[PDB]
GROMACS .gro file of C-alpha atoms in nm:
model
  468
    1UNK     CA    1  10.920  10.909  13.020
    2UNK     CA    2  10.607  10.794  12.945
    3UNK     CA    3  10.291  11.011  13.026
    4UNK     CA    4  10.046  10.917  13.194
    5UNK     CA    5   9.818  10.959  12.886
    6UNK     CA    6  10.015  10.749  12.654
    7UNK     CA    7   9.950  10.475  12.897
    8UNK     CA    8   9.582  10.440  12.926
    9UNK     CA    9   9.482  10.177  12.729
   10UNK     CA   10   9.681   9.950  12.859
   11UNK     CA   11   9.742   9.665  12.781
   12UNK     CA   12   9.682   9.569  12.408
   13UNK     CA   13   9.458   9.281  12.371
   14UNK     CA   14   9.385   9.267  12.002
   15UNK     CA   15   9.501   9.427  11.665
   16UNK     CA   16   9.169   9.747  11.697
   17UNK     CA   17   9.365   9.812  12.059
   18UNK     CA   18   9.678   9.825  11.852
   19UNK     CA   19   9.480  10.000  11.559
   20UNK     CA   20   9.357  10.261  11.884
   21UNK     CA   21   9.675  10.325  12.046
   22UNK     CA   22   9.810  10.430  11.696
   23UNK     CA   23   9.508  10.662  11.680
   24UNK     CA   24   9.585  10.829  12.000
   25UNK     CA   25   9.917  10.878  11.913
   26UNK     CA   26   9.896  11.024  11.545
   27UNK     CA   27   9.616  11.278  11.737
   28UNK     CA   28   9.942  11.462  12.045
   29UNK     CA   29  10.163  11.745  11.870
   30UNK     CA   30  10.395  11.483  11.815
   31UNK     CA   31  10.328  11.070  11.788
   32UNK     CA   32  10.588  10.868  11.986
   33UNK     CA   33  10.802  10.698  11.773
   34UNK     CA   34  11.008  10.477  12.008
   35UNK     CA   35  10.669  10.408  12.173
   36UNK     CA   36  10.468  10.287  11.868
   37UNK     CA   37  10.818  10.089  11.673
   38UNK     CA   38  10.867   9.896  12.051
   39UNK     CA   39  10.496   9.750  12.066
   40UNK     CA   40  10.491   9.708  11.616
   41UNK     CA   41  10.833   9.486  11.700
   42UNK     CA   42  10.638   9.316  11.964
   43UNK     CA   43  10.352   9.235  11.857
   44UNK     CA   44  10.580   9.113  11.508
   45UNK     CA   45  10.772   8.920  11.744
   46UNK     CA   46  10.533   8.732  11.878
   47UNK     CA   47  10.286   8.680  11.580
   48UNK     CA   48  10.591   8.610  11.327
   49UNK     CA   49  10.877   8.496  11.497
   50UNK     CA   50  10.768   8.287  11.756
   51UNK     CA   51  10.373   8.181  11.756
   52UNK     CA   52  10.491   7.938  12.062
   53UNK     CA   53  10.209   7.955  12.323
   54UNK     CA   54   9.996   8.225  12.086
   55UNK     CA   55   9.583   8.200  12.099
   56UNK     CA   56   9.479   8.447  11.999
   57UNK     CA   57   9.643   8.798  12.029
   58UNK     CA   58   9.997   8.875  12.207
   59UNK     CA   59   9.873   9.101  12.476
   60UNK     CA   60  10.119   9.430  12.539
   61UNK     CA   61  10.149   9.462  12.927
   62UNK     CA   62  10.258   9.809  13.027
   63UNK     CA   63  10.553   9.662  13.226
   64UNK     CA   64  10.707   9.511  12.965
   65UNK     CA   65  10.674   9.796  12.665
   66UNK     CA   66  10.778  10.029  12.917
   67UNK     CA   67  11.074   9.816  13.033
   68UNK     CA   68  11.194   9.824  12.730
   69UNK     CA   69  11.107  10.181  12.639
   70UNK     CA   70  11.331  10.291  12.967
   71UNK     CA   71  11.617  10.017  12.819
   72UNK     CA   72  11.632  10.243  12.494
   73UNK     CA   73  11.562  10.600  12.669
   74UNK     CA   74  11.844  10.494  12.947
   75UNK     CA   75  12.041  10.406  12.692
   76UNK     CA   76  12.092  10.768  12.460
   77UNK     CA   77  12.050  10.934  12.716
   78UNK     CA   78  12.352  10.805  12.900
   79UNK     CA   79  12.565  10.796  12.554
   80UNK     CA   80  12.464  11.086  12.433
   81UNK     CA   81  12.544  11.433  12.664
   82UNK     CA   82  12.370  11.706  12.484
   83UNK     CA   83  12.569  11.949  12.703
   84UNK     CA   84  12.863  11.865  12.466
   85UNK     CA   85  12.602  11.974  12.155
   86UNK     CA   86  12.500  12.292  12.211
   87UNK     CA   87  12.129  12.406  11.958
   88UNK     CA   88  12.229  12.658  11.835
   89UNK     CA   89  11.891  12.810  11.744
   90UNK     CA   90  11.637  12.493  11.842
   91UNK     CA   91  11.783  12.318  11.574
   92UNK     CA   92  12.100  12.054  11.544
   93UNK     CA   93  12.433  11.997  11.462
   94UNK     CA   94  12.613  11.783  11.180
   95UNK     CA   95  12.845  11.659  11.535
   96UNK     CA   96  12.550  11.592  11.735
   97UNK     CA   97  12.319  11.389  11.430
   98UNK     CA   98  12.684  11.174  11.458
   99UNK     CA   99  12.694  11.134  11.778
  100UNK     CA  100  12.312  10.998  11.762
  101UNK     CA  101  12.423  10.782  11.449
  102UNK     CA  102  12.751  10.602  11.636
  103UNK     CA  103  12.592  10.525  11.963
  104UNK     CA  104  12.295  10.354  11.773
  105UNK     CA  105  12.623  10.194  11.536
  106UNK     CA  106  12.839  10.099  11.822
  107UNK     CA  107  12.520   9.874  12.006
  108UNK     CA  108  12.452   9.656  11.726
  109UNK     CA  109  12.572   9.277  11.736
  110UNK     CA  110  12.949   9.292  11.587
  111UNK     CA  111  12.871   9.004  11.351
  112UNK     CA  112  12.491   8.956  11.202
  113UNK     CA  113  12.320   8.826  10.851
  114UNK     CA  114  12.169   9.230  10.786
  115UNK     CA  115  11.941   9.133  10.572
  116UNK     CA  116  11.705   8.893  10.802
  117UNK     CA  117  11.386   8.971  10.850
  118UNK     CA  118  11.212   9.171  11.122
  119UNK     CA  119  11.507   9.332  11.256
  120UNK     CA  120  11.363   9.664  11.128
  121UNK     CA  121  11.212   9.810  11.465
  122UNK     CA  122  11.364   9.900  11.794
  123UNK     CA  123  11.221   9.598  11.987
  124UNK     CA  124  11.493   9.418  11.750
  125UNK     CA  125  11.765   9.661  11.890
  126UNK     CA  126  11.654   9.608  12.219
  127UNK     CA  127  11.633   9.247  12.276
  128UNK     CA  128  11.898   9.108  11.948
  129UNK     CA  129  12.122   9.430  11.916
  130UNK     CA  130  12.047   9.331  11.548
  131UNK     CA  131  11.910   9.667  11.291
  132UNK     CA  132  11.816   9.644  10.855
  133UNK     CA  133  12.000  10.003  10.733
  134UNK     CA  134  11.668  10.185  10.724
  135UNK     CA  135  11.648  10.064  11.070
  136UNK     CA  136  11.913  10.206  11.227
  137UNK     CA  137  11.827  10.559  11.018
  138UNK     CA  138  11.490  10.518  11.149
  139UNK     CA  139  11.663  10.482  11.530
  140UNK     CA  140  11.860  10.737  11.504
  141UNK     CA  141  11.553  10.957  11.447
  142UNK     CA  142  11.402  10.787  11.746
  143UNK     CA  143  11.608  10.856  11.932
  144UNK     CA  144  11.658  11.217  11.818
  145UNK     CA  145  11.292  11.245  11.894
  146UNK     CA  146  11.365  11.106  12.263
  147UNK     CA  147  11.617  11.361  12.331
  148UNK     CA  148  11.399  11.640  12.227
  149UNK     CA  149  11.564  11.773  11.857
  150UNK     CA  150  11.233  11.811  11.701
  151UNK     CA  151  11.438  11.926  11.383
  152UNK     CA  152  11.583  11.517  11.289
  153UNK     CA  153  11.329  11.364  11.081
  154UNK     CA  154  11.413  11.055  10.830
  155UNK     CA  155  11.470  11.089  10.463
  156UNK     CA  156  11.385  10.824  10.170
  157UNK     CA  157  11.467  10.718   9.836
  158UNK     CA  158  11.357  10.442   9.673
  159UNK     CA  159  11.660  10.210   9.834
  160UNK     CA  160  11.795  10.420  10.116
  161UNK     CA  161  11.716  10.630  10.433
  162UNK     CA  162  11.875  10.903  10.588
  163UNK     CA  163  11.796  11.244  10.763
  164UNK     CA  164  11.838  11.553  10.723
  165UNK     CA  165  11.805  11.836  11.019
  166UNK     CA  166  11.950  12.195  11.100
  167UNK     CA  167  11.840  12.556  11.009
  168UNK     CA  168  11.491  12.518  10.769
  169UNK     CA  169  11.550  12.117  10.757
  170UNK     CA  170  11.777  12.203  10.471
  171UNK     CA  171  12.045  11.904  10.601
  172UNK     CA  172  12.121  11.596  10.493
  173UNK     CA  173  12.350  11.404  10.691
  174UNK     CA  174  12.425  10.981  10.679
  175UNK     CA  175  12.339  10.756  10.942
  176UNK     CA  176  12.342  10.388  10.811
  177UNK     CA  177  12.503  10.230  10.545
  178UNK     CA  178  12.385  10.124  10.186
  179UNK     CA  179  12.376   9.820  10.044
  180UNK     CA  180  12.669   9.548  10.059
  181UNK     CA  181  13.063   9.622   9.964
  182UNK     CA  182  12.963  10.018   9.943
  183UNK     CA  183  13.142  10.287  10.034
  184UNK     CA  184  13.059  10.430  10.430
  185UNK     CA  185  12.997  10.818  10.414
  186UNK     CA  186  12.826  10.827  10.746
  187UNK     CA  187  12.807  11.190  10.892
  188UNK     CA  188  12.835  11.312  10.478
  189UNK     CA  189  12.556  11.492  10.289
  190UNK     CA  190  12.345  11.343  10.036
  191UNK     CA  191  12.431  11.643   9.815
  192UNK     CA  192  12.714  11.433   9.550
  193UNK     CA  193  12.485  11.220   9.437
  194UNK     CA  194  12.177  11.442   9.436
  195UNK     CA  195  12.485  11.592   9.180
  196UNK     CA  196  12.528  11.228   8.964
  197UNK     CA  197  12.187  11.237   8.912
  198UNK     CA  198  12.177  10.849   9.072
  199UNK     CA  199  11.853  10.669   9.130
  200UNK     CA  200  11.962  10.592   9.490
  201UNK     CA  201  11.921  10.935   9.543
  202UNK     CA  202  11.603  11.056   9.299
  203UNK     CA  203  11.755  11.358   9.156
  204UNK     CA  204  11.647  11.548   9.544
  205UNK     CA  205  11.322  11.436   9.436
  206UNK     CA  206  11.258  11.196   9.765
  207UNK     CA  207  11.104  11.239  10.066
  208UNK     CA  208  11.143  11.444  10.360
  209UNK     CA  209  10.898  11.306  10.625
  210UNK     CA  210  10.750  11.453  10.912
  211UNK     CA  211  10.667  11.274  11.269
  212UNK     CA  212  10.314  11.140  11.102
  213UNK     CA  213  10.499  10.985  10.779
  214UNK     CA  214  10.779  10.822  11.047
  215UNK     CA  215  10.502  10.648  11.150
  216UNK     CA  216  10.356  10.585  10.816
  217UNK     CA  217  10.733  10.409  10.715
  218UNK     CA  218  10.723  10.200  11.093
  219UNK     CA  219  10.366  10.078  10.958
  220UNK     CA  220  10.497  10.024  10.591
  221UNK     CA  221  10.845   9.814  10.773
  222UNK     CA  222  10.610   9.518  10.911
  223UNK     CA  223  10.694   9.220  10.834
  224UNK     CA  224  10.423   8.961  10.864
  225UNK     CA  225  10.629   8.684  10.735
  226UNK     CA  226  10.630   8.424  10.904
  227UNK     CA  227  10.803   8.204  10.643
  228UNK     CA  228  10.916   8.172  10.309
  229UNK     CA  229  10.531   8.049  10.240
  230UNK     CA  230  10.339   8.183  10.505
  231UNK     CA  231  10.225   8.529  10.569
  232UNK     CA  232  10.111   8.639  10.945
  233UNK     CA  233   9.725   8.714  10.890
  234UNK     CA  234   9.728   8.944  11.186
  235UNK     CA  235   9.943   9.114  11.108
  236UNK     CA  236   9.856   9.194  10.739
  237UNK     CA  237   9.522   9.321  10.933
  238UNK     CA  238   9.727   9.515  11.123
  239UNK     CA  239   9.896   9.669  10.871
  240UNK     CA  240   9.619   9.727  10.614
  241UNK     CA  241   9.386   9.903  10.884
  242UNK     CA  242   9.720  10.131  11.025
  243UNK     CA  243   9.751  10.190  10.651
  244UNK     CA  244   9.380  10.333  10.638
  245UNK     CA  245   9.395  10.475  10.968
  246UNK     CA  246   9.732  10.693  10.836
  247UNK     CA  247   9.524  10.704  10.459
  248UNK     CA  248   9.252  10.894  10.660
  249UNK     CA  249   9.394  11.144  10.831
  250UNK     CA  250   9.607  11.220  10.517
  251UNK     CA  251   9.936  11.103  10.595
  252UNK     CA  252   9.969  10.904  10.283
  253UNK     CA  253   9.977  11.202  10.064
  254UNK     CA  254  10.321  11.194  10.051
  255UNK     CA  255  10.383  10.875  10.054
  256UNK     CA  256  10.356  10.646   9.740
  257UNK     CA  257  10.501  10.314   9.805
  258UNK     CA  258  10.286  10.301  10.102
  259UNK     CA  259   9.992  10.364   9.832
  260UNK     CA  260  10.115  10.081   9.671
  261UNK     CA  261  10.168   9.836   9.982
  262UNK     CA  262   9.817   9.872  10.059
  263UNK     CA  263   9.677   9.846   9.764
  264UNK     CA  264   9.877   9.487   9.724
  265UNK     CA  265   9.689   9.405  10.062
  266UNK     CA  266   9.338   9.505   9.935
  267UNK     CA  267   9.409   9.274   9.639
  268UNK     CA  268   9.482   9.025   9.874
  269UNK     CA  269   9.228   9.081  10.163
  270UNK     CA  270   8.974   9.379  10.018
  271UNK     CA  271   8.799   9.604  10.253
  272UNK     CA  272   8.458   9.686  10.216
  273UNK     CA  273   8.397  10.020  10.109
  274UNK     CA  274   8.752  10.089   9.977
  275UNK     CA  275   8.855  10.204   9.678
  276UNK     CA  276   9.004   9.922   9.497
  277UNK     CA  277   9.395   9.855   9.392
  278UNK     CA  278   9.381   9.972   9.075
  279UNK     CA  279   9.248  10.352   9.243
  280UNK     CA  280   9.506  10.292   9.435
  281UNK     CA  281   9.807  10.209   9.348
  282UNK     CA  282   9.726  10.553   9.014
  283UNK     CA  283   9.708  10.721   9.356
  284UNK     CA  284  10.112  10.578   9.405
  285UNK     CA  285  10.222  10.742   9.077
  286UNK     CA  286   9.971  11.055   9.124
  287UNK     CA  287  10.115  11.116   9.470
  288UNK     CA  288  10.449  11.060   9.274
  289UNK     CA  289  10.369  11.345   8.964
  290UNK     CA  290  10.262  11.580   9.263
  291UNK     CA  291  10.533  11.569   9.491
  292UNK     CA  292  10.813  11.407   9.347
  293UNK     CA  293  10.888  11.568   8.968
  294UNK     CA  294  10.696  11.257   8.865
  295UNK     CA  295  11.126  11.096   8.939
  296UNK     CA  296  10.976  10.812   9.124
  297UNK     CA  297  11.021  10.452   8.952
  298UNK     CA  298  10.849  10.169   9.202
  299UNK     CA  299  10.464  10.379   9.131
  300UNK     CA  300  10.515  10.240   8.793
  301UNK     CA  301  10.639   9.929   8.890
  302UNK     CA  302  10.381   9.847   9.173
  303UNK     CA  303  10.129   9.920   8.877
  304UNK     CA  304  10.241   9.705   8.577
  305UNK     CA  305  10.294   9.398   8.874
  306UNK     CA  306   9.942   9.417   8.951
  307UNK     CA  307   9.855   9.369   8.567
  308UNK     CA  308  10.124   9.165   8.521
  309UNK     CA  309   9.940   8.914   8.822
  310UNK     CA  310   9.626   8.994   8.646
  311UNK     CA  311   9.761   8.833   8.324
  312UNK     CA  312   9.649   9.210   8.159
  313UNK     CA  313   9.933   9.220   7.913
  314UNK     CA  314   9.883   9.558   7.771
  315UNK     CA  315   9.823   9.757   8.105
  316UNK     CA  316  10.185   9.561   8.257
  317UNK     CA  317  10.404   9.665   7.839
  318UNK     CA  318  10.267  10.012   7.924
  319UNK     CA  319  10.350  10.055   8.362
  320UNK     CA  320  10.703   9.904   8.217
  321UNK     CA  321  10.693  10.153   7.956
  322UNK     CA  322  10.599  10.409   8.218
  323UNK     CA  323  10.901  10.304   8.471
  324UNK     CA  324  11.138  10.354   8.133
  325UNK     CA  325  11.012  10.722   8.056
  326UNK     CA  326  11.151  10.820   8.479
  327UNK     CA  327  11.450  10.555   8.398
  328UNK     CA  328  11.549  10.769   8.130
  329UNK     CA  329  11.628  11.117   8.341
  330UNK     CA  330  11.911  10.941   8.545
  331UNK     CA  331  12.235  10.824   8.539
  332UNK     CA  332  12.297  10.508   8.598
  333UNK     CA  333  12.606  10.470   8.894
  334UNK     CA  334  12.734  10.254   9.076
  335UNK     CA  335  12.535  10.167   9.394
  336UNK     CA  336  12.191  10.172   9.215
  337UNK     CA  337  12.243   9.793   9.128
  338UNK     CA  338  11.913   9.715   9.271
  339UNK     CA  339  11.741   9.876   8.975
  340UNK     CA  340  11.967   9.770   8.692
  341UNK     CA  341  11.896   9.408   8.866
  342UNK     CA  342  11.494   9.457   8.848
  343UNK     CA  343  11.518   9.604   8.519
  344UNK     CA  344  11.692   9.264   8.405
  345UNK     CA  345  11.438   9.046   8.540
  346UNK     CA  346  11.184   9.289   8.365
  347UNK     CA  347  11.330   9.283   8.039
  348UNK     CA  348  11.433   8.869   8.060
  349UNK     CA  349  11.238   8.720   8.263
  350UNK     CA  350  10.906   8.889   8.358
  351UNK     CA  351  10.790   9.034   7.961
  352UNK     CA  352  10.981   8.714   7.770
  353UNK     CA  353  10.719   8.475   8.035
  354UNK     CA  354  10.448   8.667   7.979
  355UNK     CA  355  10.470   8.708   7.605
  356UNK     CA  356  10.501   8.318   7.591
  357UNK     CA  357  10.171   8.286   7.670
  358UNK     CA  358  10.003   8.495   7.526
  359UNK     CA  359  10.121   8.303   7.212
  360UNK     CA  360  10.043   7.990   7.361
  361UNK     CA  361   9.677   8.205   7.357
  362UNK     CA  362   9.671   8.325   7.050
  363UNK     CA  363   9.727   8.017   6.867
  364UNK     CA  364   9.452   7.908   7.114
  365UNK     CA  365   9.268   8.173   6.892
  366UNK     CA  366   9.249   8.440   7.173
  367UNK     CA  367   9.094   8.740   6.998
  368UNK     CA  368   9.157   9.106   7.137
  369UNK     CA  369   9.590   8.976   7.237
  370UNK     CA  370   9.819   9.140   7.305
  371UNK     CA  371  10.035   9.053   7.040
  372UNK     CA  372   9.823   9.154   6.738
  373UNK     CA  373   9.780   9.567   6.937
  374UNK     CA  374  10.045   9.765   6.755
  375UNK     CA  375   9.970   9.990   7.050
  376UNK     CA  376  10.148   9.706   7.287
  377UNK     CA  377  10.379   9.633   6.987
  378UNK     CA  378  10.460  10.065   7.063
  379UNK     CA  379  10.486   9.976   7.510
  380UNK     CA  380  10.823   9.674   7.484
  381UNK     CA  381  10.967   9.958   7.210
  382UNK     CA  382  10.906  10.238   7.452
  383UNK     CA  383  10.991  10.014   7.749
  384UNK     CA  384  11.360   9.959   7.550
  385UNK     CA  385  11.414  10.323   7.463
  386UNK     CA  386  11.400  10.474   7.849
  387UNK     CA  387  11.663  10.145   7.924
  388UNK     CA  388  11.911  10.280   7.620
  389UNK     CA  389  11.841  10.668   7.713
  390UNK     CA  390  11.904  10.582   8.078
  391UNK     CA  391  12.284  10.448   7.931
  392UNK     CA  392  12.356  10.746   7.774
  393UNK     CA  393  12.577  10.963   7.969
  394UNK     CA  394  12.618  10.692   8.202
  395UNK     CA  395  12.974  10.576   8.365
  396UNK     CA  396  12.829  10.289   8.382
  397UNK     CA  397  12.701  10.075   8.082
  398UNK     CA  398  12.408   9.891   8.100
  399UNK     CA  399  12.344   9.726   7.802
  400UNK     CA  400  12.501   9.423   7.699
  401UNK     CA  401  12.456   9.090   7.448
  402UNK     CA  402  12.261   8.903   7.737
  403UNK     CA  403  11.964   9.187   7.673
  404UNK     CA  404  11.988   9.149   7.316
  405UNK     CA  405  11.877   8.763   7.269
  406UNK     CA  406  11.592   8.828   7.482
  407UNK     CA  407  11.465   9.148   7.266
  408UNK     CA  408  11.480   8.951   6.960
  409UNK     CA  409  11.296   8.742   7.133
  410UNK     CA  410  10.992   8.958   7.235
  411UNK     CA  411  11.004   9.107   6.953
  412UNK     CA  412  10.929   8.783   6.715
  413UNK     CA  413  10.639   8.699   6.970
  414UNK     CA  414  10.430   9.037   6.742
  415UNK     CA  415  10.377   8.945   6.401
  416UNK     CA  416  10.526   9.142   6.115
  417UNK     CA  417  10.212   9.287   5.988
  418UNK     CA  418  10.176   9.430   6.333
  419UNK     CA  419  10.533   9.546   6.405
  420UNK     CA  420  10.452   9.724   6.099
  421UNK     CA  421  10.158   9.937   6.215
  422UNK     CA  422  10.346  10.139   6.452
  423UNK     CA  423  10.522  10.435   6.321
  424UNK     CA  424  10.841  10.572   6.486
  425UNK     CA  425  10.784  10.969   6.429
  426UNK     CA  426  11.153  11.187   6.481
  427UNK     CA  427  11.192  11.515   6.711
  428UNK     CA  428  11.270  11.693   6.455
  429UNK     CA  429  10.018  10.407   6.628
  430UNK     CA  430  10.299  10.611   6.676
  431UNK     CA  431  10.617  10.602   6.862
  432UNK     CA  432  10.909  10.903   6.919
  433UNK     CA  433  11.235  10.753   6.967
  434UNK     CA  434  11.442  10.921   7.246
  435UNK     CA  435  11.721  10.730   7.225
  436UNK     CA  436  12.034  10.694   6.952
  437UNK     CA  437  12.050  10.314   7.018
  438UNK     CA  438  11.659  10.285   6.944
  439UNK     CA  439  11.668  10.543   6.648
  440UNK     CA  440  11.896  10.326   6.487
  441UNK     CA  441  11.697  10.019   6.506
  442UNK     CA  442  11.371  10.171   6.386
  443UNK     CA  443  11.426   9.997   5.987
  444UNK     CA  444  11.537   9.666   6.169
  445UNK     CA  445  11.170   9.716   6.386
  446UNK     CA  446  10.931   9.595   6.041
  447UNK     CA  447  11.126   9.314   5.823
  448UNK     CA  448  10.884   8.968   5.852
  449UNK     CA  449  11.183   8.794   6.036
  450UNK     CA  450  11.364   8.993   6.269
  451UNK     CA  451  11.770   9.004   6.159
  452UNK     CA  452  11.868   8.930   6.508
  453UNK     CA  453  12.237   9.028   6.486
  454UNK     CA  454  12.179   9.367   6.336
  455UNK     CA  455  11.983   9.426   6.611
  456UNK     CA  456  12.280   9.246   6.880
  457UNK     CA  457  12.521   9.514   6.744
  458UNK     CA  458  12.277   9.830   6.746
  459UNK     CA  459  12.200   9.734   7.140
  460UNK     CA  460  12.532   9.648   7.232
  461UNK     CA  461  12.878   9.787   7.226
  462UNK     CA  462  12.955   9.550   6.985
  463UNK     CA  463  13.002   9.624   6.660
  464UNK     CA  464  13.267   9.368   6.420
  465UNK     CA  465  13.162   9.013   6.366
  466UNK     CA  466  13.324   8.711   6.387
  467UNK     CA  467  13.664   8.719   6.197
  468UNK     CA  468  13.643   8.372   6.023
   0.00000   0.00000   0.00000
């Protein structure tokens, strides 16, 4: 049951009332994930999914929220019999975690589109019997909290979610699906994925949430988008206020992606007296370096995108070179295709467009241009070096000739006299290459006219030219 003290702020009549509820829950022993997710899902439904009749804020009456809460706790209590799964030592068993995951799974609609917006919350689970992948993982954690299983917590990589549990919180279990058309591993550890050094499991440097970070996850999971062209200003404001609440309490310290989300929101609508977006992007990077062995990709991607939106070519290139410096120490594995797609888009779409405009601006007499800065050429080379190194040792290749066309184009945007200024130094501006592909490219990088067939051959598996 909801406790009397959790009920005193209702009805929630505004954004600020929702913030007060979050503040009150975060001041408790254990914030109530089920309560909080139902409230966010309710207000998201009436602010983004169906705004018919909206005049200011969708008032959340206790009767409505308590009935939804009852629908959730009744299903879980009815379907999970704890007596069948004795808690040896005040911690949960793998079989109990599997049973909770099965209860959530089996409740879902038989067929639906899993990539849809607004299917992340317990409100969606109860009212639509629909959840997205990470929403299932969150729902398992919320169900386990409702059952009294204090040791079950959300684990997060940059592209997946699962749970940790058991003695010392040591154990991992898959509870949801990943992607589309991958091998289901529900009930299993994540140790094989850690051991193969895939991006999906971050070499083990994934997030282990406490209950406060699970609150942060649901706040990051708010989706303000009404349609392809329109975001809810109300939900943007709510998400931003809740993220500042979490920030002030210390609960974003170990949550790089939340810091990037908050930076993006500040760029859209700055809050007076708060840190600038750039400061926040750098805090996200610092969080990843401090708590996650600098093994995360997205802190640098967030930064690079900010610089790319502000047409700061130099700083954008630097940040994408830093993204590649992280990926180089991974193996490219079968379920890592999201980060492959991201690197492909940066190399083969975003950087080309940025350099195309820089070339037009140089023609018009720009000063201090990235295209005249050898340190920016060095960043471009370091980006490709990290992608080539990533590929080394990987079970699946990364580069192909479709990348080569864009590499040659991008190289050519820098004049030979600029390119010549970078010194590529061996172990045992200056740049050291880690990848064997780039080390073999070195001479080709300073010619007045780039040799395109030679570059293609060096970047790719191809080793012959056409016969005729």
